[PDB]
Amino acid sequence: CGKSEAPPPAQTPEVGIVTLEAQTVTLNTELPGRTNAFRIAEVRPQVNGIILK
Amino acid sequence: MHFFSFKDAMVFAFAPPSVLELGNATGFDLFLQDQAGVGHEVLLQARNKF
C-alpha cells in the first residue's frame, strides 16, 4: 500500500539574533521644584504711628 | 501551516468542524481539577508533567 511520508526529523531551527556591544550612557533624573527669589524684604515698620503718605 | 513555521509568533492555524455549534476545533477535551486544596503551583506542575 504505502503512504507513510516521513518528514526530515533534524531541523535545528532558526532564531533571531542581535549582537550587543559596549556603549556609554548618561543617567539623568528630573525632579520637581519651586522658584524662589534671591532676596525678599518684607518692609515692616520700626516705629509707631499713622501712615500719612 | 508549512509557511507559518516562522520565528516570532507560535502561529497555529486550523479549520472548523462540520457542526460549528460543537466547539471550534476537533479532537478530545479534558480538565485536571485540584480537589485537595493544594496550591496553583502544584496543579500547574502537574499539567506540565502531563
What resolution (Å)?
3.2
Structure obtained using: cryo-EM
d(CA B15, CA B26): 9
Report the gap between the CA of A21 and the closest CA in chain B (Å): 23
- B9 close to A16: Cβ distance less than 8 angstroms: no
CA atoms within 13 A on the CB side of B45: 4
* Cα gap B29→B17, rounded to integer Å: 15
Please tell me the distance in Å from A6's CA to the nearest CA on chain B: 15
Tell me how many residue pairs between chain A and chain B have CB atoms under 8 A apart. Answer: 5
Cα B24 to its chain centre, rounded Å, is: 12
The maximal CA–CA distance of chain A, rounded, in angstroms, is: 124
Which residue does chain B place closest to A15, by CA atoms? Answer: B7
Distance between CA atoms of residues B19 and B14, nearest Å: 15
Cα first-last separation, chain B: 26
A19 vs A50: CA distance, rounded Å: 82
Cβ-Cβ contacts under 8 Å, A13 against chain B: 5
Q: Which three cell numbers stand for residue A47?
A: 516705629
- B7 touches A: beta carbon within 8 Å: yes
Task: Tell me which residue of B1, B29, B18 sits closest to A7, measured CA to CA.
Answer: B1
